[PDB]
Design a protein around this ligand. Structure first.
Ligand code: VR1
Length: 559
């Protein structure tokens, strides 16, 4: 029951790989300690392979089956539709990996005959063949981090033609089934503010609240064939067209459960028997399985009033404390149950009695004060990785602009406002690219967004209070202070100075640009303004922005 088997062929790159942080005339103004930032490359693929390769064992008890029966009952109320070839094509990222069959994402988005015909043939084959394993490409991802070095993560994905077929058969399913099955516990249905709101209200719902985060060790590799078949059984509970059921069964047997791994050079690297990280069902599948195992585990551990929050493999549990000594014991039982279900912990889970001390999705709840001085909760996170990536994107253009996604997601934070906004608007100004649309990601889905719309976007997501938060917590303040000293990032006084400059320049520009200067940097001036709702704020269509997770699902949405 090994997660992977290898032939010995190396996981190769499909282009040039940089490890050291690229430096340009702008680097120093943001970060001086350049050696602490690095990018993971294929060179460390071998190390990752050893970590993700192990034997899985599963002992499924009655709690497991009891929870599953419940999940299926909810899933049976779901009705999902097949997406047309055109609709699926539209969801394909302009820069998605091209097909090995004479066409690329551009041809797919354009509905070229060649692309449409191959997709139809791939679909036909899925209906007629439910046994032959589908080929996948294994690659080492190039991600940026701050030292203290980790081996590159692996990404396994099927060909473009297959990815479009996954959309047709399962897009509607993975977009609507999770919230129906898990209710308020499905994390991807919330915007950052709504996530904090749910966490806060949940924590208050308890007489004596207690909570903890549970980090599974290499979750993808712990997903067994059984887990993937159980996932399919859940999808099949939905009201689906017979053609969709066949396609889902086929995709499960031939791709989701496992298959051969091929490097960029076309050499067989081995075989997979665990979760593929680059398929449409990755996020929904992990979310369902994690929720199923954790739910069953809570019962086995006898935790009282268990409220969960799941986002793929990230898990948050808030419940009624049965006492400090009892909580620590119950948690140990939880871990033991999760382990029996093939989901051992990476790091020992610890009970917390302070909401702000629980970290999940690399985030945590914190509190500040709005213009009225009222206590306001918001989502933040350790800025280390965002800043390292911001440094990289400062001297290198990338497919995904993490700084933009981070501003949108953490707009209310001290670090995003003082540093990210100031630094990058200064850059956008100097190059006059404020109106240029940029790609970023939100819950795994790719979105093309223009910087000029940030004020509106942030207002809709976080409200006007995002532009006026102050008096952050000492804990947050010092975590940011530490990070800046570690990376060698200039202090507040410097950023405030730059913000006034950036702010003044934006105000001069006028229109959309002035709005950015007025709202985004109102904290830079000594005498604040009023800051009132933005007229075009409602015009924005943020409908499918916070509905589901699509990490590795090759999903696109143009704003
Ligand atoms: C890493 C070390 C560090 C830097 C900043 C802090 C802590 C801060 S900064 C702050 N507030 C200012 C701010 O709002 N100033 S004001 O002039 O807008 C202001 C001051 C007082 C009030 N008031 O109501 O009393 C309102 C607004 C700030 C917010 C966002 C940002 F990116 C930088 C600085 N509150 C805090 O706890 O720690």
């Amino acid at each position: 029951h090994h997660s992977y088997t290898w032939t010995g062929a190396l996981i190769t790159p499909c282009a040039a790989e940089e490890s050291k942080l690229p430096i340009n005339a702008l680097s120093n103004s943001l970060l001086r300690h350049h050696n602490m930032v690095y990018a993971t490359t294929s060179r460390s693929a071998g190390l990752r392979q050893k970590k993700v390769t192990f034997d899985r064992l599963q002992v499924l008890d009655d709690h497991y089956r009891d929870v599953l029966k419940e999940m299926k009952a909810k899933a049976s109320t779901v009705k999902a539709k097949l997406l047309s070839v055109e609709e699926a094509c539209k969801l394909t990222p302009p820069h998605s990996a091209k097909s090995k069959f004479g066409y690329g994402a551009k041809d797919v988005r354009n509905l070229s005959s060649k692309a449409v015909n191959h997709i139809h043939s791939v679909w036909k084959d899925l209906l007629e063949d439910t046994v032959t394993p589908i080929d996948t490409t294994i690659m080492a991802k190039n991600e940026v981090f701050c030292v203290q070095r980790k081996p590159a993560r692996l990404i396994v994905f099927p060909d473009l033609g297959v990815r479009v077929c996954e959309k047709m058969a399962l897009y509607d399913v993975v977009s609507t089934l999770p919230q129906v099955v898990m209710g308020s516990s499905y994390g991807f249905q919330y915007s950052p503010g709504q996530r904090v709101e749910f966490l806060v209200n949940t924590w208050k719902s308890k007489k004596n609240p207690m909570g903890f985060s549970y980090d599974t060790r290499c979750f993808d590799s712990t997903v067994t064939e059984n887990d993937i078949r159980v996932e399919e059984s859940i999808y099949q509970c939905c009201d689906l067209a017979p053609e969709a059921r066949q396609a889902i069964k086929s995709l499960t047997e031939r791709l989701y459960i496992g298959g051969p791994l091929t490097n960029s050079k076309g050499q067989n690297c081995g075989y997979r028997r665990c979760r593929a990280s680059g398929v449409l069902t990755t996020s929904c599948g992990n979310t369902l399985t994690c929720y199923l195992k954790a739910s069953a585990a809570c019962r086995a551990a006898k935790l009282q009033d268990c409220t969960m929050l799941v986002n793929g493999d990230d898990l948050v549990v808030i419940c009624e404390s049965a006492g400090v000594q009892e909580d620590a014991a119950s948690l140990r039982a939880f871990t033991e149950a999760m382990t029996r279900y093939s989901a051992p912990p990476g790091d020992p889970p610890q009970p917390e009695y302070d909401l702000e001390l629980i970290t999940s999705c690399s985030s945590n709840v914190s509190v500040a004060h709005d213009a009225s001085g009222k206590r306001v909760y918001y989502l933040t996170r350790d800025p280390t990785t965002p800043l390292a990536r911001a440094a990289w994107e400062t001297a290198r253009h990338t497919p995904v602009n993490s700084w933009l996604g981070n501003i949108i997601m953490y707009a209310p934070t001290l670090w995003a406002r003082m540093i990210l906004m100031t630094h990058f608007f200064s850059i956008l100004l100097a190059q006059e690219q404020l109106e240029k649309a940029l790609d970023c990601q939100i819950y795994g889905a790719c979105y093309s967004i223009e910087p000029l719309d940030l004020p509106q976007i942030i207002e809709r997501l976080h409200g006007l209070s995002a532009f006026s938060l102050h008096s952050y917590s000492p804990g947050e303040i010092n975590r940011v202070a530490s990070c800046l000293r570690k990376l060698g990032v200039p202090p507040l006084r410097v950023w405030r100075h730059r913000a006034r400059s950036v702010r003044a320049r934006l105000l001069s520009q006028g229109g959309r640009a002035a709005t950015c200067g007025k709202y985004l940097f109102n904290w830079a001036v000594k005498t604040k303004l009023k800051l009132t709702p933005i007229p075009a704020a409602s015009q924005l269509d943020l409908s499918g922005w916070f509905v589901a997770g699509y990490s590795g699902g090759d999903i696109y949405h143009s704003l």
